[PDB]
Design a protein around this nucleic acid. Structure first.
Lengths: 197, 170, 227, 188
RNA sequence: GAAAUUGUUGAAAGGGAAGGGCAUUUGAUCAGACAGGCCAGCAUCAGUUUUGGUGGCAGGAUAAAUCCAUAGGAAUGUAGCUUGCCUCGGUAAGUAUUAUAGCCUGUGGGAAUACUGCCAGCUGGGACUGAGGACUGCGACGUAAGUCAAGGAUGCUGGCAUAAUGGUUAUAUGCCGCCCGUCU
RNA sequence: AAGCUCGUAUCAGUUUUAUGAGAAUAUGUAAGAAGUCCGACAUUUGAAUGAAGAGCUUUUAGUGGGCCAUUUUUGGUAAGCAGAACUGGCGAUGCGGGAUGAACCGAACGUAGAGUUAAGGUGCCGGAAUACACGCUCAUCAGACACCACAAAAGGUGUUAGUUCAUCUAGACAGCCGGACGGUGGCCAUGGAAGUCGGAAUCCGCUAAGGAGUGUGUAACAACUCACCGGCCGAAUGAACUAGCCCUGAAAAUGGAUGGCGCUCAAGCGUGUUACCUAUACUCUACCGUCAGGGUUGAUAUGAUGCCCUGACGAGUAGGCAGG
RNA sequence: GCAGUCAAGCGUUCAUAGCGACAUUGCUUUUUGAUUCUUCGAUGUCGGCUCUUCCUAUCAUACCGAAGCAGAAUUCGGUAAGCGUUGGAUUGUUCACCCACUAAUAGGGAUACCCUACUGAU
RNA sequence: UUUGCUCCACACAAUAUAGAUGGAUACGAAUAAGGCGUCCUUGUGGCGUCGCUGAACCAUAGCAGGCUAGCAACGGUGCACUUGGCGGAAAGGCCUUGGGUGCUUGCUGGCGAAUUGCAAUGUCAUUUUGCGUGGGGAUAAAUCAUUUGUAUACGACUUAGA
């Protein structure tokens, strides 16, 4: 429906987000993803770390400079397990992934913009309670992403500036809501109340 | 499938010097009439040495249960032939009608013992009108009075893919 | 799965069953009609040779012990059901461990004999201590020459559950500081009861008490409330 | 088999207070304050009045229930830390070589130093944690006293030092020396 | 004065392959007819087919049920009564069988509905198709001449009359494709 | 293929009746005029079903290398193994699915359009639902398809559903305390051995219960505990066995795979209900082509191998036939 | 290996129509370390280097548990493959087996200019 | 090497889109919990209220959006100026003062729309570039050749030279 969609990757699941992201791509909704270090995976840390090490040991026997790249950072993990879902070798693939832009944290301009989610991939919904999961930021930090303390800091700055925004917006919407309330019990409003507004 | 209850009554053969072999009925569970008839011959062969050519149906009657509204804690005896040799069972159910109860039971055996419908003889199904004859706990715990319990963490299901709310259960 | 495995033995002993329960339930009612009196004796802490002694003492009387509700089975708790009349009232008062006595000689000799009968048993009374030196079988109650040292195997237990500071040099056991084991005028902790067991100190007075009696030909309850 | 619910209760005396937001628990009372996080175990609390409180599980499995009694065992220890406070005690023993024992406060870290283990030259530091106090023993030779409100903290600290003074390469059937605990009781 | 092969110019494409096949786009290029050729749309009907709503019917235990009346019973015990405390109602028992709630079984009553199946019952939306080429016949409407959904489609209207549709062709794109012949 | 005879014709990789040989399966024959009587008996003339035909004579081309699967049967550990016999698939044979294939499931082909399905599937690659519903399972290599990498025996204080035995408000089990006596330190054994270094035996009184005594351990003794009983608390609980999921059994070495991604109230395993996806297979329709049954020299006109009407069918190496 | 015993279980139901779990007993070239120099048709073509990487079921180097561990060192076992495993003596022959060092001297597997790969360069 | 290079607007040309055709509308944090209004003892406080999908919110009428008339209110909004702020993670945008400038569909009037002939995307946006426009702005390196040699297969890397 929109030109652009801006996903928060928090409390989310890699496979089940990758899937919908792929289909929305190949139907043509340009997508950006952010906060991928707040992402999550089913299964415990040790399981996911061993799944990563078994990939890690796989390179070309004779020359590693051409062989598989064991990318570390979380956005690139999500991109890995998305380009497995699309035909990157073709041109339709490459012209899908020229619609995908994946980041950590929320850099600009997107921090001022509307973050969304996907309910059919959330952890809290699409898992049972009383069950494990792994934080991707911690996993990447445990296999050599050397950056985790920094996105923390910038997330702090964005959080405080957004809370200071939220105060203003809450006050202003309080004012307009009080105004519309005072605008109530007036026939110009009562007609709309009859017609569902 | 969506099971049904069926009366089936059969008669060995009209024959000279043995007219009207006495009668043979069964209470039978199936989706339609034909599977009832086939299960009827299948169990009826087991009881004694007769066949479909040496057999015949008297008639059948579909059985609508008398009290749909009434909860009825049933208890049922079953024999079945598993992967290994056969063995028996008694189970305890809190369901509405015999048909919905056994429809749940066949699924339950299908889960817990890989019980397909062929190898599972309904020995008997019954009602337990009073308390103090239930043995199990996974029925008993629903029966105390003033009973209440919550449904936490309802997994809602949106049709849309995106949403703008970072949702909440309740 | 994931159970606590109940530990099993191969002992030649066997369990009691219900045959003993029905046996004593029969024998109580057997004693009832044949004997005249039915005495109730409240006693919670009793000794095996002492019970042997009092068993062999009174053959004219018959002492029997058993579970409370099995005695209620035999005698019958209510007035509505009982072996004979005017026993249900005595059925109520018997709260704790009780031993039933059946006499036919005299009502007064029974109540007075056990008030005369007093012994020395463990508290379960005065205070005691140990010196800050070598420890003995009594632990300084007697002269140390005739007092023999405790055996060194149980010294870790003294450290563990009696909590006492101790350290084992060559075979004499020793300590650095003394410890008053208990005080007077208070019912004892389990460590205090057990250390006076280990010393072998039955410092507590012991009297078996009576709470009531019965008599058939009168068919009445004798209320004798004494300790 | 989905026991439809199960419950335990935590009974509490008057003078102590407790307070719980979602699973974030605090205990404030005579000795002072304690706090713990329970966001990982997915249970539910409800108060009746002011001495008693019901943990509860709805529609739970065996593991999901076996959390519960452990939580009860946690919370009673928490409360009793504030009512009584806990007391452990160790003795620093030797055959031939007298141990040196020392508290040191460097950078406010309150380290515990030990030396002269069978004549070894190495210094072995054991730090001290929050909300736990240490006391060298009065009037008991070769003895040390611990005091605090957090059982887990004091016990972990007691374990650290007796692992750090651990003998290796040698036979404990002949060699004896090592710091262990006399007992584990309350302050009161 | 052909072909392999080679150069210059013009056009086009190009990240470890190329070439071919089905359809189309872009670009280049091109024949035919208007003095009736090309592309489309609307209505009605025919064939195949898909998908909705609504109507009438028969069945089974002439549904069971619900509902109404009716006898009896019991509790996961309702009122009421009784007891122990006690924040003076609130627990625990014991009573109590409708009482200051009600339920179950059994009998009886008259309907509806679901479920299944039937309609030569109606009615609508959407796609593909347009074959054949004076008439002949089984048919319906009717008093009727004649009319018609009756042995295969016609009518009305619009614009263009040009590289616009289409064809060829390089190329991109989706998908597919194992190198030819021969003995085994 | 060329003739001759039939034409509704003898027939059938087929059933049924009847009856044989050797229980079913399989296997054989009869189911009429070519038969019944000494000129008499026609399609109710002797069961069902189906029939682009059936038979006789002459001649012509190619062919006569086996493999695999089911069954009976012989051997063994059995093979990409051998001894025998029936049937089927291949080879000549495309196509949808099996991720891909000498052998599996489905289905045999003109060119095309629409429709509907098969086997297999519907998280994304990928057209089709992150449909609904009951359960289970959480694997430090989970598992994801029958025969297209399987192992059992068993082990498992992981989870579930069970069976059968047992105990129980006349007080089940957990947990705390006490009781847990004599001849007795039982017999020789010994230097010392007293409930336990040890061999033989192994009992009786009181008993609620207490063995000539499970472990702790003294040179001996001693002391402590449960197994055996009673108390204090009060509701269920224990033993054995079974079977589903799970772990283990169940290992190599260039870096490596449920097909990849990844998936855990699943996108897994077990079951059900509808809906949905698409193959040259099915239906309908136009056209081509052959083949067969029918009509058609007749004036006027042009083709008689021609024209017209109807129907069904179309793969195909060697080889054969006809038109080009 | 063969033959028993013990025998959880199985068998239209079953001891005894019969199998069978785990242990046990039967000597199998000698009861007092006396030895015995027993290599008895090794019928195949590799053998021996330059030299790279991988596996662990580790020979030392790590950290650990238990063992009569008083110590030193040793006997086993566990996680462990990060790093290391030699110089000579003897045969066409790999078969055969010593001396000494060191911490040890573990076992295994894997013409050539032409396009590719590798090492390097605009 | 003729006056080339740039930035302000603007008339015309081309070159194509991985594909605009009302708005990419801002908290964070948990989910066996929380948002919002409010009260006071400022709290892990109380009182009330909400959720069950954004099927919302904001915007929206005029010829693809004209010319005009007023009524009422001091507002909203565009455009270029102007003031002071804020933000470095990939800020390249978000605020705010001042006026100017319009339009107002907040309410009520008048005029015009035809003929594209019943529809045919019925062209409205935005990338890049060029040639011309009339107005400001600044008027350099590198390579080769040569020489060295810290380098050296040839190239290259490093140096020097008005």
């Amino acid at each position: 429906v929109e030109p652009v969609v801006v996903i928060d990757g928090k409390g989310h699941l890699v496979g089940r987000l990758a899937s919908v992201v792929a289909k929305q791509l190949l139907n043509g909704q340009k997508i950006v993803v952010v906060r991928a270090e707040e992402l999550n995976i089913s299964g415990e840390f040790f399981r996911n770390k061993l799944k990563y090490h078994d990939f890690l040991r796989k390179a070309t026997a004779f020359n590693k400079t051409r062989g598989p790249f064991h990318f570390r950072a979380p956005s690139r993990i999500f991109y890995k397990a998305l380009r497995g879902m699309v035909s990157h070798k073709t041109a339709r693939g490459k012209a899908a992934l020229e619609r995908l832009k994946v980041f950590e944290g929320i850099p600009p301009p997107y921090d001022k913009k509307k973050r969304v989610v996907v309910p059919q991939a959330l952890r809290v919904l699409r898992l049972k309670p009383g069950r494990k999961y792994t934080t991707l930021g911690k996993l990447s930090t445990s296999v050599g992403w050397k950056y985790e303390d920094v996105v923390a800091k910038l997330e702090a700055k964005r959080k405080v500036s957004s809370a200071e925004y939220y105060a203003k917006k809450r006050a202003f919407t309080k004012k307009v809501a009080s105004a519309n309330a005072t605008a109530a019990e007036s026939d110009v409003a009562k007609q709309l109340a009859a017609l569902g507004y | 499938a969506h099971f049904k209850e069926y009366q089936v009554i059969g008669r060995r053969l009209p024959t000279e010097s043995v007219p009207e072999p006495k009668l043979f009925r069964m209470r039978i569970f199936a989706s339609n009439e034909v599977i009832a008839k086939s299960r009827y011959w299948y169990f009826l062969q087991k009881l004694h040495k007769v066949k479909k050519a040496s057999g015949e149906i008297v008639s059948i009657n579909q059985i609508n249960e008398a009290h749909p509204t009434k909860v009825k804690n049933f208890g049922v005896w079953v024999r079945y032939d598993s992967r290994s040799g056969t063995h028996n069972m008694y189970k305890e159910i809190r369901d509405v009608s015999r048909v919905a109860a056994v429809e749940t039971l066949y699924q339950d055996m299908a889960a817990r013992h890989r019980a397909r419908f062929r190898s599972i003889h309904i020995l008997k199904v019954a009602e337990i009108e009073k308390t103090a004859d239930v043995k199990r706990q996974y029925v008993k715990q629903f029966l105390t009075k003033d009973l209440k319990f919550p449904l936490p963490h309802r997994v809602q299901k949106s049709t849309k893919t995106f949403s703008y709310k970072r949702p909440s259960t309740f | 799965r994931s159970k606590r495995s109940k530990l099993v033995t191969l002992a030649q002993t066997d369990k009691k069953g219900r045959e003993n329960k029905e046996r004593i339930f029969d024998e109580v009612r057997e004693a009832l009609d044949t004997y005249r009196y039915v005495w109730v004796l409240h006693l919670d802490d009793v000794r095996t040779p002492v019970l042997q002694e009092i068993r062999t003492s009174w053959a004219g009387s018959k002492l029997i012990m058993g579970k409370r509700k099995v005695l209620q089975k035999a005698l019958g708790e209510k007035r509505e059901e009982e072996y004979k009349e005017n026993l249900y009232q005595l059925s109520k008062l018997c709260s704790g461990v009780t031993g039933l006595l059946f006499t036919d000689e005299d009502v007064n000799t029974v109540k007075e004999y056990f008030k005369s009968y007093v012994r020395s048993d463990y508290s379960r009374p005065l205070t005691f201590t140990i010196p800050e030196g070598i420890v003995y079988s009594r632990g300084g109650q007697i002269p140390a020459e005739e007092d023999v040292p405790m055996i060194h195997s149980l010294e870790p237990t003294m450290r563990n559950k009696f909590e006492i500071p101790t350290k084992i040099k060559a075979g004499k056991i020793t300590i650095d500081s003394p410890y008053l084991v208990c005080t007077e005028g208070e019912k004892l902790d389990v460590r205090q009861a057990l250390i006076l067991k280990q010393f072998g100190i039955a410092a507590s007075e012991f009297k078996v008490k009576v709470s009531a009696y019965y008599d058939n030909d009168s068919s009445t309850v004798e209320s004798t409330n004494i300790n | 088999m989905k026991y439809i619910q199960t419950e335990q209760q935590i009974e509490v005396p008057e003078g102590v207070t407790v307070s719980i937001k979602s699973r974030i628990v605090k205990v404030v009372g005579p000795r002072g304050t304690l706090t713990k996080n329970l966001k990982h175990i997915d249970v539910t609390f409800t108060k009746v009045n002011n001495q008693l409180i019901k943990v509860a599980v709805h529609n739970g499995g065996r593991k999901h229930v076996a959390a519960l009694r452990t939580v009860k065992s946690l919370v009673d220890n928490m409360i009793t830390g504030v009512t009584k406070g806990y007391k452990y005690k160790m003795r620093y023993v030797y055959a031939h070589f007298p141990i040196n024992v020392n508290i040191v406060e460097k950078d406010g870290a309150k380290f515990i130093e030990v030396r002269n283990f069978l004549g070894d030259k190495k210094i072995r530091n054991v730090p001290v944690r929050d909300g736990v106090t240490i006391e060298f023993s009065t009037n008991v030779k070769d003895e040390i006293v611990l005091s605090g409100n957090s059982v887990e903290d004091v016990s972990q600290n007691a374990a650290d030092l007796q692992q750090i003074c651990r003998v290796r390469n040698k036979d404990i059937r002949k060699f004896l020396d090592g710091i262990y605990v006399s007992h584990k009781g309350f302050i009161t």
